[PDB]
Design a protein that fits this description.
homodimer; alpha/beta; Uracil-DNA Glycosylase, subunit E; five-stranded mixed β-sheet; about 35% helix; DNA-binding; hydrolase/dna; dsDNA; HYDROLASE-DNA complex; tetrameric; G/T mismatch-specific thymine DNA glycosylase
DNA sequence: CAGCTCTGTACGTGAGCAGTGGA
DNA sequence: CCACTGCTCACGTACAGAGCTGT
């Protein structure tokens, strides 16, 4: 229902659990609010102006940020996705990453990665911490970074100011690598 | 898109504006469980056990309650709507009411009615209060009852029940 | 006991909204 | 004509409360 906005040689690709009802209707990646995503991006410095879901297709290629989503179907969401739903979901994800070889995969939401590690790596992870996870996407030099959901539904991060921090860190990792070159 | 759920011999027909995302996605009417509507229904004796949104196809059955909305095009908000879609919205609605002929049309907001008026009867209705309104549906004996939103009262539900009981009662 | 799959909740913020009562 | 209370929602995620566990 909600397409991918991937190109080759992306620095960052943002992975979302699934598209919300609002995103399904609206057709563009991260509308809301509550979605910090757009605000955080501008706040973090990842974009120098504030933009919004209407600009989602400009992001690879102005910014080299592509969107995609672990599960393409729309739910409310998110509590309603089966446990098997993601499993067949993430598999497709890997293949995408493999093809596209972005520098960094950014997992918007710990629930995503928590199942991802379990099923793609085969590791139940202890007490996950946001930020960089050790591993690479298997046939590629693409690094996984985990970040709390943009969705305002998670309580522990009340505001865009609360999650901006990860976005700043992500930018750092980006121009670390880009820089070494 | 969301169905109408209407039967010929209905007492109450419940009329929203457009369906919303949740309603359209679930395929059923007033789905919550943060919608008061099902609670209100049960509390005020209209149902006698607490139903839930999926049970909306059985309400014309034993309860005589049908659902509709003024504009069937789905949308998050009202704000998303040209008046033109309402204008066309209104005519269509009226037709079905004329056709199905329920005792009472119940307006799910003051808002819907507020514009139903100027579309249909071409007036503004000054310092509107809830409850039974004076006019009937054009060319019909169907009444208009406006009660407050389900989204926020239980009293008016009971009133509506009673009014229904009166209407039933006169004919008998 | 910590250690650990289960469910299973009760979490803060803001846009949005229905209704009311004001510059 | 717009400023009010209070109320669901939103691409979740953190912690008590069960029923199991080992040198």
């Amino acid at each position: 229902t909600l397409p991918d906005i991937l190109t080759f040689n992306l620095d960052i690709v943002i992975i979302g659990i699934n598209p919300g009802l609002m995103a399904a209707y609206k057709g563009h990646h991260y509308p809301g609010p509550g979605n910090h995503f757009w605000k955080c991006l501008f706040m973090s410095g990842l974009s120098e102006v504030q933009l919004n879901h209407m600009d989602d297709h400009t992001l690879p290629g102005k910014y080299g940020i592509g969107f995609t989503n672990m599960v393409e179907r729309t739910t409310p969401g998110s509590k309603d996705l089966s446990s098997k739903e993601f499993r067949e979901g993430g598999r497709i994800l890997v293949q995408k990453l493999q093809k596209y070889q972005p520098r960094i995969a950014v997992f918007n939401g710990k629930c995503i990665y928590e199942i991802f590690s379990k099923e793609v790596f085969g590791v139940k992870v202890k007490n996950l911490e946001f930020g960089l996870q050790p591993h690479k996407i298997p046939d590629t030099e693409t690094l996984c970074y985990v970040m709390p959901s943009s969705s305002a539904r998670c309580a522990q991060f009340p505001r865009a100011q609360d999650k901006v921090h990860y976005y700043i860190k992500l930018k750092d990792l980006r121009d670390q690598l880009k820089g070494i070159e």
